[PDB]
Amino acid sequence: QILSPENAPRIGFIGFGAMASRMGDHLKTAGYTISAYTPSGVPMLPTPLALAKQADTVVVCVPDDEALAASMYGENGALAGMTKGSLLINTSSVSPEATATLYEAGQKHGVVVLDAPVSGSTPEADSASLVILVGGDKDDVARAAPIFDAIGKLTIHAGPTGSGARLKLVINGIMGAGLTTLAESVAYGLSAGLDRSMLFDALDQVAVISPHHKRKLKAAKDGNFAPQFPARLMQKDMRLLLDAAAREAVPVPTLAAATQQLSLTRRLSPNEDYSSLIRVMEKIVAN
Amino acid sequence: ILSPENAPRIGFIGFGAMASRMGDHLKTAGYTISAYTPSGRSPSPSVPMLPTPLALAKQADTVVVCVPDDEALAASMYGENGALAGMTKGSLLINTSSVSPEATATLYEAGQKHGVVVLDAPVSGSTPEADSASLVILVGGDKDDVARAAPIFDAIGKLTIHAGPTGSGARLKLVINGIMGAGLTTLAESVAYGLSAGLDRSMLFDALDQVAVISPHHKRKLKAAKDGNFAPQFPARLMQKDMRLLLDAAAREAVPVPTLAAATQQLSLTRRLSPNEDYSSLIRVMEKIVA
Amino acid sequence: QILSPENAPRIGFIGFGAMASRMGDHLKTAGYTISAYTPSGRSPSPSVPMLPTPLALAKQADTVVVCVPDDEALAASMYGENGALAGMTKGSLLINTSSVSPEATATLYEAGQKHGVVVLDAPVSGSTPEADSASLVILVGGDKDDVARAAPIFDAIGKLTIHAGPTGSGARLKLVINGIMGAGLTTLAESVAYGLSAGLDRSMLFDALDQVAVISPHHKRKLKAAKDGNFAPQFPARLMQKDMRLLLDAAAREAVPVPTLAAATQQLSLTRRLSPNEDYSSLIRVMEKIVAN
Amino acid sequence: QILSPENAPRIGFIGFGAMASRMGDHLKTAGYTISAYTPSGRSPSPSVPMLPTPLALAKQADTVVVCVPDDEALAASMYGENGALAGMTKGSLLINTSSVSPEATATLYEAGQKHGVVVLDAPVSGSTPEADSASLVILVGGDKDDVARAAPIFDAIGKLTIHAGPTGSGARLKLVINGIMGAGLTTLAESVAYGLSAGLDRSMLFDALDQVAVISPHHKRKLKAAKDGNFAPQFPARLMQKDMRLLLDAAAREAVPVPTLAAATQQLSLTRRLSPNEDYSSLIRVMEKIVAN
Ligand SMILES: NC(=O)C1=CN([C@@H]2O[C@H](COP(=O)(O)OP(=O)(O)OC[C@H]3O[C@@H](n4cnc5c(N)ncnc54)[C@H](OP(=O)(O)O)[C@@H]3O)[C@@H](O)[C@H]2O)C=CC1
Ligand SMILES: NC(=O)C1=CN([C@@H]2O[C@H](COP(=O)(O)OP(=O)(O)OC[C@H]3O[C@@H](n4cnc5c(N)ncnc54)[C@H](OP(=O)(O)O)[C@@H]3O)[C@@H](O)[C@H]2O)C=CC1
Ligand SMILES: NC(=O)C1=CN([C@@H]2O[C@H](COP(=O)(O)OP(=O)(O)OC[C@H]3O[C@@H](n4cnc5c(N)ncnc54)[C@H](OP(=O)(O)O)[C@@H]3O)[C@@H](O)[C@H]2O)C=CC1
Ligand SMILES: NC(=O)C1=CN([C@@H]2O[C@H](COP(=O)(O)OP(=O)(O)OC[C@H]3O[C@@H](n4cnc5c(N)ncnc54)[C@H](OP(=O)(O)O)[C@@H]3O)[C@@H](O)[C@H]2O)C=CC1
């Protein structure tokens, strides 16, 4: 009962933005028929219910808990439109609480919900280099493998339901605080009189910055903050992680500070790349 | 022009984990090595030891300094027994220690009064990179004096960054130290959340090796931390000192750095609990909090 | 319209813990008849009749006062087949003194509107000693006319009613005050810890700080208690840390950078992990232990 | 040898700014003869003779009081052939009221000992209004008998002398109180900022916070001034942020984790960068402007 294009050709999306649309292109190449629902308007369906009624597998890619609940539940929601025995793959970055609510609601419809957020942004989605972080029973993960293989380079089975959502929060913290650390360290360097191009070029050559953050640093050198992961979404992910860390009573001061810097970043420019904090701190130092 | 032919003798003020490793690559490149340490001992028993900084400098052509902090630097640089009193006008002093911008300016000016150019040339990389001569040299000074020292820098490292005039190497080292320190505290806290939320420890450590948002340095520390291996490459006492220097400098420049400030406090706790183990032991500290 | 004991004698509580039980005694003294629902069926007041469900509580009260720990407990007891809201008559008032999120507040206000029920968000400034002495400060969101209706209830349990604005304003003002209280304590605990680490005599240091103008009366009381190792719960760490989580979530939703509040929250997470049930001021003891090793 | 006006009438000041000139007024009233040295030779007190060097100041004074901004200024005027120590006599007392580091305090104490001069580290709690009213709290480190020698001086300028311990204890206790003051302000600025960002009425919010028990009297006075946009300096951001820098350096040297104090320090760096000379409470305005955009 693998979800190959032979057994399950129709994949309906709930949400179809920068990430899901690039996933869909890869699933199309792999031989699936793609449909999609978005509250605004590949064939578009009018409701989540209608989307689910004409799909074999539903993939969800929505911004937050509120959007997830608005489209999963109620008589016009996605769950009302799928059939016992089918699978719902949620690739959204949402809270552990929302993950548990949807898993339990899926169980009442006979629908297995995999929490399968991804590591990687729009360039990795373009190249199908996403890393899938999936929670669920190993047998249900196996059913979704052709889907995961088409959109990504690696599927990490993180544990039972909820484990993928948690692993995504871990990686989001590392990403977000990695950027705020870099912006702050660059700002000190500029404030202490270091030549800007020297400094940016020097940091490209050290081993203590990630490949992801080195790519952001190079873009920031030219002032390029075209959105790959917009500040509004990075800051939301930081909010979710801090809430989850507080619920577990784990003290995370570096992540907490980073979140506040990303709040400023979102306020000043919600739609540019989250790396624009580098420019924000540069402007603080120049004034 | 400080090739082994022209200037074969390199004397070290301080000769511990980093400097003894640099000394081996300089020995291999053809230089004659000598050292001073306050204890009279070092990891390299085959290196002649001199009784004072003054005595070390009087029998070396170039002096390399590698001491723990500002206070150690002033103790061995100044006064009638210090290194400056022993070097000759026109020679180079190369400071690879991680010290404050204030200490750097004090030594440069003191050097000028002796006719000695002081390059502030801290390095990026730890004991594994010193072993393999993969250090990145971060050097402040005039471009002509930097060119004079290139044979020395090439022997101990894989890249020399001319950061600007005197003081620029010290500042760039502070920048890179902040990225390293807060990179570790970020990773320790993120791992701690994951464990507190029920993720299998072995799965989580292995999964994070697979993602592009952790640096190669911090991936190596995560693998060591999976093994409980915190043998000192960069001890907490020195990493936390370096964070203290960075936050002092950021406050003097009035630059708000909340992520770096949070990370420093986590590294204070790390040093308090274990000053001599690797600074990455914060990962173990956080694991014990969540247990 | 005024919810005096003559016009509306029956006050039913959803939640009846440390704070609500003390408000109930002042409401009993003012002439009201008190009833309550809790999930355990128990309360600090054995004389108070217990109803078996939130719906049953609401069906036999003229006014309902809610005092529950968090958003989840609120939703569990106001909504669903046995929730309290559907048990209330049109034109009646629901008074929520719980410290919950602005989102939970907006959801309850809108659900109340659908049922014809006015919901006042009326959290309180003060802890169990202020509840004991009816010296709470009520922070209330709603229309002036609806606040006026609740005035005899607010007057019995508190010393001052601040009309913070329309619906949601009380909840927001409570979060502001919570932030000041939480970070005031973490600031004090960390400053004391430096002092002790630098060799200052403990008794001298605690007494000296009682003499300075830069500590609040509330935190000076906590400092004297901490000198005695007295962390009997007035505001337990589990609830203070929850309130800080709510404040940081709200500040993130508004995109306001609050690094001092964010750091304080992490210190209170450690405090709650080590002792969820003692007073939140126990971080002072936590920090003393860190510097002693 | 009590340092009464009859026993030691001449008090010479090293530094004579906002704090010291007010101290000197109260010492003049108490019967002392005041002189001063400043690097600019300028001071708002016309009756105070200005001496041209720290050396010259100390040579014509019986007791020397120091009130300089930081470690660097202290070392410039204390040491060397033209410094103050070179001009005082064995058996005299130097009273340092400056807010300086523990390291600077130890260095001056030991330098004083080589000169036979006892150095009391005696920073003060309180700002320009407290110096005007001699309401300062003196925080003094040293031997009990030397503190007793300085009692008439301390009584003239303040309302309370806290003997914090041996040499260095006053410097450390000042750092403790500075942290409480600075983080108390940043907490308050961020909490107000959240409340405004969440739509609360500004005048409502400022007036409500004046009524709560979790804000100190000092910070309530700052909040009232901020309601009017008044940040005329009493304690300028450049000096408060310097004191926070000293506290965080000392906390790092003691390896004490203080995340709330560290976060507050960074907010006060932003405050100093935007306006070094206005009152440190100007962060309230900084945060209002962030939220207003
Ligand atoms: N680099 C990245 O972009 C990363 C993204 N993620 C996560 O992936 C998810 C989406 O990312 P991205 O695709 O970039 O975000 P986008 O904002 O680009 O796409 C958002 C999509 O969600 C749709 N949507 C909004 N509300 C609803 C709703 N109530 N029901 C159904 N669909 C809805 C929008 O449709 P409309 O146009 O009608 O609003 C749009 O199609 C988020 O959870 C994000 O955090 C995680 C890591 C990295
Ligand atoms: N990963 C690392 O290890 C990194 C190191 N650095 C910087 O390099 C410098 C040294 O690091 P490392 O070599 O690891 O530290 P070590 O402690 O291993 O070496 C310290 C050396 O300094 C000597 N020393 C101490 N006080 C004095 C003094 N007053 N005069 C002369 N020598 C003295 C010690 O001699 P004795 O044994 O007699 O005390 C020992 O030889 C520090 O500034 C450190 O921050 C920078 C980045 C990373
Ligand atoms: N100083 C303080 O204590 C302050 C408290 N507050 C806020 O006041 C509220 C109550 O505080 P406090 O009285 O101290 O808390 P307590 O923990 O002392 O009492 C909690 C009460 O809520 C009840 N409860 C739990 N879950 C539910 C539910 N789903 N439905 C109904 N009742 C429920 C408990 O009943 P059971 O025993 O059956 O669980 C108990 O009666 C919280 O929001 C707190 O943050 C605000 C400021 C200060
Ligand atoms: N609320 C406050 O203002 C409080 C301040 N403090 C501490 O008290 C000290 C001074 O505070 P305040 O008086 O307000 O600061 P001011 O800036 O008002 O006065 C500074 C004084 O120091 C003098 N000065 C500067 N450098 C030297 C030097 N090298 N040698 C001698 N004198 C020097 C200046 O002289 P010139 O004018 O010639 O530069 C000026 O007279 C600082 O340590 C401050 O942190 C402590 C408690 C309260």
Short mmCIF file of N, CA, C and O in Angstrom, two decimals, chain C residues 84-150:
data_model
loop_
_atom_site.label_atom_id
_atom_site.label_comp_id
_atom_site.label_asym_id
_atom_site.label_seq_id
_atom_site.Cartn_x
_atom_site.Cartn_y
_atom_site.Cartn_z
N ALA C 84 -19.12 25.66 30.42
CA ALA C 84 -19.89 26.57 31.24
C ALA C 84 -20.67 27.61 30.44
O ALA C 84 -21.71 28.09 30.90
N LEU C 85 -20.19 27.97 29.25
CA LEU C 85 -20.75 29.13 28.57
C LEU C 85 -22.20 28.87 28.16
O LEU C 85 -23.07 29.72 28.37
N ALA C 86 -22.47 27.69 27.62
CA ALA C 86 -23.83 27.33 27.20
C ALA C 86 -24.81 27.21 28.36
O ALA C 86 -26.02 27.11 28.11
N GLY C 87 -24.34 27.24 29.60
CA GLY C 87 -25.19 27.22 30.77
C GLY C 87 -25.62 28.56 31.29
O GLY C 87 -26.35 28.63 32.28
N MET C 88 -25.19 29.65 30.64
CA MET C 88 -25.47 30.99 31.13
C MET C 88 -26.62 31.61 30.35
O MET C 88 -26.80 31.36 29.15
N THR C 89 -27.39 32.44 31.05
CA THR C 89 -28.53 33.11 30.44
C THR C 89 -28.10 34.38 29.72
O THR C 89 -27.09 35.00 30.08
N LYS C 90 -28.87 34.76 28.71
CA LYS C 90 -28.55 35.96 27.95
C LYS C 90 -28.65 37.19 28.84
O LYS C 90 -29.53 37.28 29.70
N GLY C 91 -27.71 38.11 28.67
CA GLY C 91 -27.62 39.28 29.52
C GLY C 91 -26.83 39.10 30.80
O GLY C 91 -26.62 40.09 31.52
N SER C 92 -26.40 37.88 31.12
CA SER C 92 -25.58 37.66 32.31
C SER C 92 -24.11 37.96 32.01
O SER C 92 -23.69 38.11 30.86
N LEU C 93 -23.32 38.07 33.08
CA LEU C 93 -21.89 38.38 33.01
C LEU C 93 -21.04 37.19 33.40
O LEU C 93 -21.33 36.49 34.36
N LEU C 94 -19.96 36.99 32.64
CA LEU C 94 -18.89 36.07 32.95
C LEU C 94 -17.65 36.92 33.23
O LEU C 94 -17.27 37.75 32.40
N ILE C 95 -17.06 36.75 34.41
CA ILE C 95 -15.91 37.54 34.85
C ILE C 95 -14.72 36.60 34.91
O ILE C 95 -14.68 35.69 35.74
N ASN C 96 -13.74 36.83 34.04
CA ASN C 96 -12.57 35.97 33.97
C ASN C 96 -11.41 36.68 34.67
O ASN C 96 -10.87 37.65 34.14
N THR C 97 -11.03 36.17 35.85
CA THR C 97 -9.88 36.67 36.59
C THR C 97 -8.62 35.86 36.32
O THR C 97 -7.58 36.15 36.92
N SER C 98 -8.70 34.87 35.44
CA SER C 98 -7.55 34.05 35.09
C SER C 98 -6.54 34.88 34.33
O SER C 98 -6.88 35.86 33.66
N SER C 99 -5.29 34.47 34.40
CA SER C 99 -4.25 35.11 33.61
C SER C 99 -4.02 34.19 32.41
O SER C 99 -3.38 33.14 32.53
N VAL C 100 -4.59 34.57 31.27
CA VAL C 100 -4.57 33.78 30.04
C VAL C 100 -4.11 34.70 28.90
O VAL C 100 -3.92 35.90 29.08
N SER C 101 -3.92 34.11 27.72
CA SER C 101 -3.38 34.84 26.59
C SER C 101 -4.41 35.81 26.00
O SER C 101 -5.61 35.64 26.19
N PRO C 102 -3.94 36.84 25.29
CA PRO C 102 -4.87 37.68 24.52
C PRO C 102 -5.70 36.90 23.52
O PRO C 102 -6.87 37.27 23.28
N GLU C 103 -5.16 35.84 22.91
CA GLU C 103 -5.95 35.02 21.99
C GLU C 103 -7.07 34.30 22.72
O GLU C 103 -8.21 34.25 22.23
N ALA C 104 -6.76 33.68 23.86
CA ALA C 104 -7.81 32.98 24.61
C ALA C 104 -8.88 33.96 25.06
O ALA C 104 -10.07 33.63 25.09
N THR C 105 -8.45 35.17 25.42
CA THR C 105 -9.38 36.23 25.81
C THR C 105 -10.31 36.60 24.67
O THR C 105 -11.51 36.79 24.88
N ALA C 106 -9.76 36.76 23.46
CA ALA C 106 -10.59 37.15 22.33
C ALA C 106 -11.56 36.04 21.95
O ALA C 106 -12.73 36.30 21.61
N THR C 107 -11.11 34.79 22.02
CA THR C 107 -11.98 33.66 21.70
C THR C 107 -13.16 33.59 22.65
O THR C 107 -14.30 33.37 22.22
N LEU C 108 -12.91 33.77 23.95
CA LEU C 108 -13.97 33.70 24.95
C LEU C 108 -14.93 34.88 24.80
O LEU C 108 -16.15 34.71 24.93
N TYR C 109 -14.40 36.08 24.54
CA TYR C 109 -15.29 37.22 24.34
C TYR C 109 -16.22 36.98 23.16
O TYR C 109 -17.42 37.25 23.24
N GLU C 110 -15.68 36.46 22.06
CA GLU C 110 -16.52 36.25 20.88
C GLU C 110 -17.51 35.11 21.09
O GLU C 110 -18.66 35.18 20.66
N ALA C 111 -17.09 34.04 21.76
CA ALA C 111 -18.04 32.98 22.08
C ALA C 111 -19.13 33.50 23.01
O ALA C 111 -20.32 33.18 22.82
N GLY C 112 -18.76 34.33 23.99
CA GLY C 112 -19.76 34.95 24.83
C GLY C 112 -20.76 35.78 24.05
O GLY C 112 -21.97 35.73 24.32
N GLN C 113 -20.28 36.56 23.08
CA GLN C 113 -21.19 37.36 22.25
C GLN C 113 -22.21 36.47 21.56
O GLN C 113 -23.40 36.80 21.50
N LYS C 114 -21.76 35.33 21.01
CA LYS C 114 -22.69 34.43 20.33
C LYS C 114 -23.77 33.90 21.28
O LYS C 114 -24.89 33.62 20.84
N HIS C 115 -23.46 33.77 22.56
CA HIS C 115 -24.42 33.32 23.56
C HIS C 115 -25.16 34.45 24.24
O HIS C 115 -25.96 34.19 25.15
N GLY C 116 -24.91 35.70 23.87
CA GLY C 116 -25.53 36.82 24.56
C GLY C 116 -24.96 37.10 25.94
O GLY C 116 -25.65 37.70 26.77
N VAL C 117 -23.73 36.67 26.20
CA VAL C 117 -23.10 36.81 27.51
C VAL C 117 -21.95 37.81 27.39
O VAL C 117 -21.11 37.68 26.50
N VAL C 118 -21.93 38.81 28.28
CA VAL C 118 -20.80 39.73 28.36
C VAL C 118 -19.67 39.06 29.13
O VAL C 118 -19.87 38.58 30.25
N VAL C 119 -18.48 39.05 28.54
CA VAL C 119 -17.29 38.52 29.19
C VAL C 119 -16.36 39.68 29.50
O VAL C 119 -15.90 40.38 28.59
N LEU C 120 -16.10 39.90 30.79
CA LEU C 120 -15.10 40.85 31.23
C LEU C 120 -13.81 40.10 31.48
O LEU C 120 -13.81 39.09 32.20
N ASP C 121 -12.73 40.54 30.85
CA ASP C 121 -11.40 40.04 31.19
C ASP C 121 -10.91 40.90 32.35
O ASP C 121 -10.64 42.10 32.18
N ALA C 122 -10.86 40.31 33.55
CA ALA C 122 -10.60 41.04 34.79
C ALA C 122 -9.56 40.32 35.65
O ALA C 122 -9.81 39.98 36.81
N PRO C 123 -8.36 40.10 35.11
CA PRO C 123 -7.27 39.61 35.97
C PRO C 123 -6.92 40.64 37.04
O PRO C 123 -7.31 41.81 36.97
N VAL C 124 -6.16 40.19 38.04
CA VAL C 124 -5.89 41.00 39.22
C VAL C 124 -4.39 41.12 39.44
O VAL C 124 -3.64 40.19 39.14
N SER C 125 -3.97 42.29 39.92
CA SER C 125 -2.62 42.51 40.41
C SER C 125 -2.63 42.32 41.92
O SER C 125 -3.45 42.91 42.63
N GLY C 126 -1.72 41.48 42.40
CA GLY C 126 -1.74 41.06 43.78
C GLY C 126 -1.60 39.56 43.83
O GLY C 126 -1.81 38.87 42.83
N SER C 127 -1.24 39.04 45.00
CA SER C 127 -1.08 37.61 45.17
C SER C 127 -1.99 37.15 46.31
O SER C 127 -2.95 37.85 46.63
N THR C 128 -1.68 36.01 46.93
CA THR C 128 -2.54 35.53 48.00
C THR C 128 -2.58 36.44 49.23
O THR C 128 -3.67 36.52 49.84
N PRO C 129 -1.51 37.14 49.64
CA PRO C 129 -1.69 38.08 50.76
C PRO C 129 -2.64 39.22 50.41
O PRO C 129 -3.37 39.70 51.29
N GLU C 130 -2.64 39.68 49.16
CA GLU C 130 -3.56 40.75 48.78
C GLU C 130 -4.98 40.23 48.63
O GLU C 130 -5.94 40.95 48.94
N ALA C 131 -5.15 39.00 48.16
CA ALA C 131 -6.48 38.40 48.14
C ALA C 131 -7.03 38.26 49.56
O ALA C 131 -8.21 38.55 49.80
N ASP C 132 -6.19 37.83 50.50
CA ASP C 132 -6.59 37.71 51.90
C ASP C 132 -7.19 39.01 52.43
O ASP C 132 -8.21 39.01 53.13
N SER C 133 -6.55 40.14 52.13
CA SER C 133 -6.93 41.43 52.67
C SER C 133 -7.81 42.23 51.73
O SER C 133 -8.04 43.42 51.98
N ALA C 134 -8.31 41.61 50.66
CA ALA C 134 -9.16 42.29 49.67
C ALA C 134 -8.50 43.58 49.17
O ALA C 134 -9.16 44.61 48.98
N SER C 135 -7.19 43.52 48.96
CA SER C 135 -6.44 44.65 48.43
C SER C 135 -5.91 44.38 47.03
O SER C 135 -4.95 45.03 46.58
N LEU C 136 -6.53 43.45 46.31
CA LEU C 136 -6.25 43.24 44.90
C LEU C 136 -6.51 44.51 44.09
O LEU C 136 -7.32 45.35 44.46
N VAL C 137 -5.83 44.62 42.96
CA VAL C 137 -6.12 45.66 41.97
C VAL C 137 -6.71 44.96 40.75
O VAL C 137 -6.06 44.08 40.16
N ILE C 138 -7.94 45.31 40.38
CA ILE C 138 -8.62 44.67 39.27
C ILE C 138 -8.27 45.41 37.98
O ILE C 138 -8.30 46.64 37.94
N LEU C 139 -7.89 44.66 36.95
CA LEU C 139 -7.46 45.20 35.66
C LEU C 139 -8.47 44.70 34.63
O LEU C 139 -8.39 43.55 34.19
N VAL C 140 -9.42 45.54 34.22
CA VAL C 140 -10.61 45.02 33.56
C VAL C 140 -10.77 45.64 32.17
O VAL C 140 -10.58 46.85 31.99
N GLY C 141 -11.07 44.78 31.20
CA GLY C 141 -11.39 45.20 29.84
C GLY C 141 -12.87 45.00 29.56
O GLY C 141 -13.44 43.96 29.89
N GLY C 142 -13.47 46.01 28.95
CA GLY C 142 -14.88 45.93 28.59
C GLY C 142 -15.48 47.31 28.46
O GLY C 142 -14.80 48.33 28.60
N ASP C 143 -16.78 47.33 28.16
CA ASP C 143 -17.50 48.59 28.10
C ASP C 143 -17.71 49.13 29.52
O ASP C 143 -17.91 48.38 30.47
N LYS C 144 -17.68 50.47 29.64
CA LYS C 144 -17.86 51.11 30.94
C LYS C 144 -19.13 50.63 31.64
O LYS C 144 -19.15 50.46 32.87
N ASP C 145 -20.21 50.44 30.88
CA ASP C 145 -21.48 50.02 31.48
C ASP C 145 -21.39 48.62 32.08
O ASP C 145 -21.95 48.36 33.15
N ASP C 146 -20.69 47.71 31.40
CA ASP C 146 -20.55 46.36 31.93
C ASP C 146 -19.62 46.32 33.13
O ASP C 146 -19.84 45.55 34.08
N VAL C 147 -18.55 47.13 33.12
CA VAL C 147 -17.72 47.24 34.30
C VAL C 147 -18.54 47.74 35.48
O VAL C 147 -18.43 47.22 36.60
N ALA C 148 -19.39 48.74 35.24
CA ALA C 148 -20.21 49.28 36.32
C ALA C 148 -21.10 48.21 36.93
O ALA C 148 -21.29 48.18 38.15
N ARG C 149 -21.63 47.30 36.10
CA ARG C 149 -22.47 46.22 36.61
C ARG C 149 -21.70 45.36 37.60
O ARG C 149 -22.28 44.87 38.58
N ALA C 150 -20.41 45.13 37.34
CA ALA C 150 -19.60 44.24 38.16
C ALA C 150 -18.99 44.93 39.37
O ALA C 150 -18.29 44.27 40.15
#
